Amino acid sequence: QKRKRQAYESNLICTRSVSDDKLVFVKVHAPWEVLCTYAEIMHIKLPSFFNPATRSRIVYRLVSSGIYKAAFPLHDCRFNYESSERYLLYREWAHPRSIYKKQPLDLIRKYYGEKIGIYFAWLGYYTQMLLLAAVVGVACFLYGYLDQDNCTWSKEVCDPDIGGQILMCPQCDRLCPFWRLNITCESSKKLCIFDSFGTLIFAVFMGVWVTLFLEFWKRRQAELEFFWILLIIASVIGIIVYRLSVFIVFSTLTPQMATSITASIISFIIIMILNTIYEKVAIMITNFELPRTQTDYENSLTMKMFLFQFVNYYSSCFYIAFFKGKFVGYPGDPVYLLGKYRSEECDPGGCLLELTTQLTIIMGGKAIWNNIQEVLLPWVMNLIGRYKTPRWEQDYHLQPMGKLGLFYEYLEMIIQFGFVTLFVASFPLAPLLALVNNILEIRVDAWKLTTQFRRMVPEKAQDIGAWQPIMQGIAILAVVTNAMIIAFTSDMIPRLVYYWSFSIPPTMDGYINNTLSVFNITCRYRDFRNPPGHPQEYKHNIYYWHVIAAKLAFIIVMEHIIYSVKFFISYAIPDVS
């Protein structure tokens, strides 16, 4: 026990704490010749001469068994008062009062290390790219807002004659009664913002913006040089079925917004606690496997953890986008999934607004609650530690960062990126919310890393790591996902077909009465079905196949055009300075 530690200390050669007599901490420094020897064995760069991050790396499992209590570097100074580097970049960068200043990226790679430097460089560059995407999203938001007097469909669903005379079918078995449509008017008014031509121009822009983000980040990186799959499928089913359950336990502006916000909040609570669960089961799964190296361990953990997180966070959104209300048929013979399991018909405006509210609640709530957790949990852990003098004694009573470190940090921003990219065709303010989150996110990551956490050992990484193929896969998936959101989720394509193709005798006015289908009780539900009385009644009509062929042709045209533009831009940008 103590013999192993004494022999290891004698090999390393080859004070106790004033507050706790049982703990003893040994100072570790290197001589000049030994530093030059370790700097020859590890080929460091050249122009007191060795930097403190370089010294702490060159000086850098036995503590995993519990023999050694703690091994760490030491901070330079207290942040609250000057001794003095930590005080400096706390005073001008890490403080929330210095929210507007530029990041001292050379100072952050000086003090913390190039993985922390590359995370904060990626975070700041993400913020600057999100500023461009956010002002274009504000431009398309103004395009939707100022043309609210020209959206003919919202003005005729808000008018009582065209909108109120619908009396559309119930989406629900026990009474849930059939209703005049003008009550969705206050939900439809903002819908003129959320699927107009402005958000289509924004989505086609956002494909290009993701491409520019990736290529100029490649340039900035160039400058700055089997049971678990079955469990994932069970998770895929689980998030959808509790999305249904939270909508049901709610079901037993104001009414629709209360519905969407309340169900989104309670589902988001389940999302967070199931996220902690998924952290634990994925770490148990990758510990059941034997990984040979820590890097292969964290790559496998990155893939499995991100797949569980992808499933957990976006499966509700994918249900609302592509599965909710998409497979329901006519009110005669509704689709009972397993018997007595009638699926949820959507509102006639579409499930885009419900997707929008769920997106902004999950995104902004993960932002708010994750920053609250990132502040408070190390702070309250240090507080209950302090409720139970030398420098290293002060630096001892800090929550250690962990073996992974910045991993979860990257993870949450990648999840934020999946809201910025995969669902950007729903609401254009996703880069704005991401920007206002990221401006504080640099400060909260900075502040907890400076104040609350022990100093992580500096070590260089040439990129973000295994998150880069994840981001490229998210980028390729974003084109398909935005195409299915504009085609399948929103209703922009049916009114596009109504204006361009059926103002003709075989304008935009008269769209709402001409879209829906009348239903015999043996009301006008939202579907394109040949009507009681037509020879092919309740089968899909000519107009269903016209609109769905325009949907599929839009998916093909938009995907091929955007993928060729992404190819032309990745081929045209030299990817170097």
Add this chain to the structure above:
Amino acid sequence: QKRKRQAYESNLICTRSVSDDKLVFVKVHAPWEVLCTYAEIMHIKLPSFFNPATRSRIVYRLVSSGIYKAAFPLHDCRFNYESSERYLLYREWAHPRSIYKKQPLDLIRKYYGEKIGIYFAWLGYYTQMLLLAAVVGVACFLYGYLDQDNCTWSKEVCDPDIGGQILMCPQCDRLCPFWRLNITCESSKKLCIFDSFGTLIFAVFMGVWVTLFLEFWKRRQAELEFFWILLIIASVIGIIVYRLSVFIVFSTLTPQMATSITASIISFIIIMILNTIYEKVAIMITNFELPRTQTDYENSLTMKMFLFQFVNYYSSCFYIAFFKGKFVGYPGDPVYLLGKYRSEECDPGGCLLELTTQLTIIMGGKAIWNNIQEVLLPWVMNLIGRYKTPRWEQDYHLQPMGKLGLFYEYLEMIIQFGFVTLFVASFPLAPLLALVNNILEIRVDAWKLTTQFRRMVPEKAQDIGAWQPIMQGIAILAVVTNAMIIAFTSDMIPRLVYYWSFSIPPTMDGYINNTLSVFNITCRYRDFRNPPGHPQEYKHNIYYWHVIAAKLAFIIVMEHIIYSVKFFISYAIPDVS
């Protein structure tokens, strides 16, 4: 003049020809210490000790101005009789009598050099992969042939009652008279081969096969370690308009096969002479640009030359596939392209058979005529040279390879690959024809390289070069192109919709009368148009939009499924030994 050559020879130090007194050839050898010095300046590998390819590279513009007559290595021996390496791999590899033996790839990199070795390794591995793709293509060809008694549509177009009672519309202005359909029966019978379920399984297989080809070739490479764009657009228009012209100058089994084979032959003749033209204008264009290095010169030449060759060879095929007969409307108001320019309505079986004949003529004729040129042109040039003793005198009178060398060789196989991949859904025997071409292609490239050409200087290349992104782009384009061939070119999707979707009251029998549309003279042309007498007469009907929505959904499903399978296979194959 002679002073520059004398000074260069004196720097190099730092016999005349018996047949021609004006020419003098100096032997060039290196001493042992100078060879070790050049082998230290160029870091050669280690285990008379320096190999002859290595010696010829280490010993290796003034001849471009015309000062030096010729500078070359020397061959080891005459091929016809032993002196003796060249005689050996001529006797057992390069001879056409050794067509069945394996390639001595270590001997070919010993004698010729690693670019020639990697071309012949790529050629042989291409041949072995084509053997697998060819036996699967023969399997789907047997699937189409043995089920010829079960193709209901061909048996009812060959029957006089269902097929002969059509009397379909003329595709032509001056009389070209309307005709009973059973005359396409002998063309439709083999059509039961060419678009059945077997070729669909072959196309979905061929996406996987291209993927396996690319990944195992990555493994084998790992083991074996602005005016011109406007001219390209003018070429794009030019090949299509002379495809129209050769069809017209023909127009002024037996009748349709005579048409297709004759027009394909005369167009292919124009293809070849315009290919020589495109060689010359592309070499003039890349000489008008100043390239800094020979490698950047040949990369730019590779891109421009392949783009011109792509346009030249496949623009006729792309016209037949995606533009011929696709944009023609109903016989009332035909599409005159510029006035008095009625486009060519296709046969009711589709333009797939015309595409098939054009493909096999262009592919097999480029194979035959390119091997005939590859044999004869160096042979006849050496013959007229000989119509006007030491070793170097014999090796002097050979056609030199040129500065590019194997470039055109790679080029033609890449063009062959574009027939193996981009149009594989038309006829499944494309890998078979490629296999029977490649077995002789190794021998003709081997034989002309051994007998007729001067020995190219050995120099190492780690891959095929700039053709590898070209092949990956051809591979990505192949999925889209095969999807548009199965959907848009062939008629497999309309009969798939007829069987699965309209045997119902709103079997495969009755497909031909139910596909076409009747035409009032104010006959049954091949289109899906609402009929004289329907309220929406000659507009597209329900069934057009059903079939074209199934086409577009097939494109989306097939592209996404195949691209995910390609991603799973490229991610699952470790790309290393």
